[PDB]
């Protein structure tokens, strides 16, 4: 089969373990097994929690293709779905799980180069959507996967329109626009990324922790926002609150942030004052506790040599 998006029969993969239970489905720890191709992939199952019309399913279908479409380092691809009375998608399995849980376990040996690093692909991922022409909708720590320490991946870009997000919620990652018209841009996913670079500089704290969703529209338009993060130099602030700014179009584009990172990223220890910073290290595949804990097969990266 060399369909883009793999239309799976259920005895082509199998769930073994929970992984995570989200707002909109349940992912699970699986292997795919390709009818006749004798090879077992690890793979993530989300099996959606509302059962879906045939209507609902066309519409699935459609978008699910342009998931399957995606082709770049830092972002995740759907390898294929299934159509039962749930919905199934299927995606490598990212055996270090997402950055946020990454960085809140890691807090104490994650230094200024690999912040800076993963801030520069999360805003390439990001600008290769922007190419894509696909507006992300839901961008946050949580949905950015771990491939391996030093290398990070976008994912669920391919939910928020389809859950309704454009019609009659991640407020605290939201826009002002969004939150007041349900207004989504490549440029509301800029203020999202400037929220995400927040929530990893403080080692996954919590936006505006304890203040009431209902609340953020009007501390926005009084000025308010996120705090500097205590590692961050003015340099790095500065950044984040041009992501914040009420004039989307006088945020920062996504390729900007790229050139601006990388360049902060070849002299780190300037730009970000962490306390051991040149002695930190995170452990490997082999050394990982998240890792053996998942795996301990061909790695979908090496079936799919084209
Ligand atoms: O698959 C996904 N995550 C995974 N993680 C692990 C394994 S798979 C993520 C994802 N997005 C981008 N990517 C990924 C993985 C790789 C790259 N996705 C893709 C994805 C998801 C959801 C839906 C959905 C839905 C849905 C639609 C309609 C109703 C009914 N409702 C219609 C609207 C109406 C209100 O107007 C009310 C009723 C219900 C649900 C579709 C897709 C996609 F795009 F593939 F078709 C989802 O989450």
């Given at each position: 089969?060399?369909?883009?998006?793999?239309?799976?029969?259920?005895?082509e993969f199998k769930k073994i373990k929970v992984l995570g239970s989200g707002a909109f489905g349940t992912v699970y720890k699986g292997l795919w097994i390709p009818e006749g191709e004798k090879v077992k992939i690890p793979v993530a199952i989300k099996e959606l929690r509302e059962a879906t019309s045939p209507k609902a399913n066309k519409e699935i279908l459609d978008e699910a293709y342009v998931m399957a479409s995606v082709d770049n380092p830092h972002v995740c691809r759907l390898l294929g779905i299934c159509l039962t009375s749930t919905v199934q998608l299927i995606t490598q399995?990212?055996?270090?799980?997402?950055?946020?849980?990454?960085?809140?376990?890691?807090?104490?040996?994650?230094?200024?180069?690999?912040?800076?690093?993963?801030?520069?692909?999360?805003?390439?991922?990001?600008?290769?959507?922007?190419?894509?022409?696909?507006?992300?909708?839901?961008?946050?720590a949580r949905n950015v996967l771990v491939k391996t320490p030093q290398h990070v991946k976008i994912t669920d870009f391919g939910l928020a329109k389809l859950l309704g997000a454009?019609?009659?919620?991640?407020?605290?990652?939201?826009?002002?626009?969004?939150?007041?018209?349900?207004?989504?841009?490549?440029?509301?996913?800029?203020?999202?990324?400037?929220?995400?670079?927040?929530?990893?500089?403080?080692?996954?704290?919590?936006?505006?922790?304890?203040?009431?969703?209902?609340?953020?529209?009007?501390?926005?338009?009084?000025?308010?926002?996120?705090?500097?993060?205590?590692?961050?130099?003015?340099?790095?602030?500065?950044?984040?609150?041009?992501?914040?700014?009420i004039d989307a179009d006088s945020r920062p584009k996504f390729r900007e942030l790229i050139i601006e990172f990388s360049k902060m990223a070849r002299d780190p220890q300037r730009y970000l004052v962490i306390q051991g910073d040149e002695r930190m290290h995170?452990?490997?595949?082999?050394?990982?506790?998240?890792?053996?804990?998942?795996?301990?097969?061909?790695d979908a990266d090496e079936y799919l040599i084209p």
């Open positions: 089969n060399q369909a883009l998006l793999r239309i799976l029969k259920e005895t399995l990212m055996p270090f799980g997402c950055l946020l849980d990454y960085v809140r376990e890691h807090k104490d040996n994650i230094g200024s180069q690999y912040l800076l690093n993963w801030c520069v692909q999360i805003a390439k991922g990001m600008n290769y959507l922007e190419d894509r022409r696909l507006v992300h909708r839901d961008l946050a454009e019609e009659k919620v991640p407020i605290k990652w939201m826009a002002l626009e969004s939150i007041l018209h349900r207004i989504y841009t490549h440029q509301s996913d800029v203020w999202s990324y400037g929220v995400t670079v927040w929530e990893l500089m403080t080692f996954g704290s919590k936006p505006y922790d304890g203040i009431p969703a209902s609340e953020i529209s009007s501390i926005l338009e009084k000025g308010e926002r996120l705090p500097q993060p205590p590692i961050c130099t003015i340099d790095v602030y500065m950044i984040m609150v041009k992501c914040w700014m995170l452990p490997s595949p082999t050394d990982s506790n998240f890792y053996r804990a998942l795996m301990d097969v061909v």
